[PDB]
Design a protein around this ligand. Structure first.
Ligand code: ADP
Lengths: 42, 308, 42, 42, 42
């Protein structure tokens, strides 16, 4: 972990980006969050 | 006997799955953009596999690589490789990589490599052992110049692909089902110069309606849509004047100025084609089922989840 | 008549079809009816 | 459905027409009916 | 704006990703934030 936690944030922040490509704010505001919380979990 | 073309397809022509896009921009455009970085220990990729469900645009993306390649882009299906006799089935492979090295720097595409693999068991014995053996040894071997040419593999069945050829295709990429925005883009591309009727969020309504298609599915619903108002004109009785001197369009039986006639009855030009609008689109969506299956997607998530 | 009545139902049922090509339920529900009544008139 | 229901009436009303081409009133009076009922189901 | 605000979040969330490629948590926790706040500003 960590080396992966740092890798999963990116995985999240990507999905989030991919989500805004359909204006899906819901998913976005969530993944961009599950990600941030985790960067604090670091 | 051997085909070649410098096609039209661009990266902006391709819509969707940008990780494979930047991967091929690296492994193909990066020898073009910076050949001087690749020296000694740093070597370009020799074997790249694309795979997944059918109709996802792997050959089309290979044509994008072809246009931005500036190289002798070969491409072959299995049909130029199946054994009719007992030995042009193999010497043509030898001449394929031979003339591929003759036109170096070059790119080779093979579509549906699953027809050449599967050494486990003894089914499809002589063709699989001889032709597949020559694909292995001739792909790299004793004195093959593995530099230069690039081997692009496509398939729909990657688990029946043998592990040795799986190692030969050293950089493999899964191509999933695309998303909402890319199919909106392919709708707005494939409508082309035809005068449409909808807006961008209406194409978003279309892509929301069409969850889980392929690129060919989009190509044929757009194709059927380019039959739809023409199908209105070829149908039924009764037209009507509207509005540069006389102009008539199809209307229901009994309407404001509804004469009874056929398209044949009506004068050159002075036809008013029905607008192109969605009810025809949604009717075409209700016309055709998605072809692909989801348990096959579970196996693609199995092999992708492991080896991807 | 009859040989024609049978021919006019089809004439109707066509118009009806042609009508649904504009979602015009009104015309349809009518011609598809003027037709049916007539097939009973046979 | 609907976009299809509207498409199946036509499918019916065609068969009905095709049927009268053999004077088969039975089939006709039926399909031209299964169709009409359905245009009311709309 | 908006059509752009939605475009700048992605611009942020990218930089953030690019930042974690050097383990730079500082930049990350910031851009991934300037972005989120803005998705709420939407
Ligand atoms: N990602 C994509 N972007 C743009 N067009 C696509 C894409 N995927 C498929 N298509 C369209 O689908 C058509 C057929 O795809 P094809 O290359 O036969 O799929 P396969 O991957 O099975 O070879 C192409 O003409 C192409 O225009």
């Amino acid at each position: 972990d960590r080396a992966s936690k740092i890798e999963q944030i990116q995985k999240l922040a990507k999905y989030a980006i991919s989500a805004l490509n359909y204006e899906d704010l819901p998913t976005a505001k969530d993944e961009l969050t599950k990600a941030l919380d985790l960067l604090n979990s670091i | 006997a051997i085909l070649s073309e410098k096609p039209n397809v661009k990266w902006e022509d391709v819509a969707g799955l940008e990780g494979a896009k930047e991967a091929l921009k690296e492994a193909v455009i990066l020898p073009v953009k910076f050949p001087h970085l690749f020296k000694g220990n740093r070597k370009p990729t020799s074997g790249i596999l694309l795979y997944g469900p059918p109709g996802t645009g792997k050959s089309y993306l290979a044509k994008a690589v072809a246009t931005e390649a500036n190289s002798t882009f070969f491409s072959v299906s299995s049909s130029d490789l199946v054994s009719k006799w007992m030995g042009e089935s193999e010497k043509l492979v030898k001449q394929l990589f031979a003339m591929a090295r003759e036109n170096k720097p070059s790119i080779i595409f093979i579509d549906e490599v699953d027809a050449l693999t599967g050494t486990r068991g003894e089914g499809e014995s002589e063709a699989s052992r001889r032709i597949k053996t020559e694909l292995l040894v001739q792909m790299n071997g004793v004195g093959n110049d593995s530099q230069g040419v690039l081997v692009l593999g496509a398939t729909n069945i990657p688990w029946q692909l043998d592990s040795a050829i799986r190692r030969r295709f050293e950089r493999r990429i899964y191509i999933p089902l695309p998303d909402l925005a890319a199919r909106t883009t392919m709708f707005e591309i494939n409508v082309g110069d035809t005068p449409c009727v909808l807006t961008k969020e209406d194409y978003r309504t279309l892509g929301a309606m069409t969850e889980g298609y392929s690129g060919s599915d989009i190509a044929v619903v757009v194709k059927d849509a380019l039959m739809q108002p023409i199908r209105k004109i070829q149908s039924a009785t009764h037209f009507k004047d509207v509005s540069e001197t006389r102009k008539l369009t199809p209307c229901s039986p009994g309407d404001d100025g509804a004469i009874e006639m056929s398209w044949t009855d009506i004068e050159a030009d002075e036809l008013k084609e029905p607008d192109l609008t969605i009810k025809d689109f949604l009717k075409a969506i209700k016309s055709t089922r998605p072809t692909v299956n989801e348990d096959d997607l579970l196996k693609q998530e199995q092999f992708t989840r492991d080896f991807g």
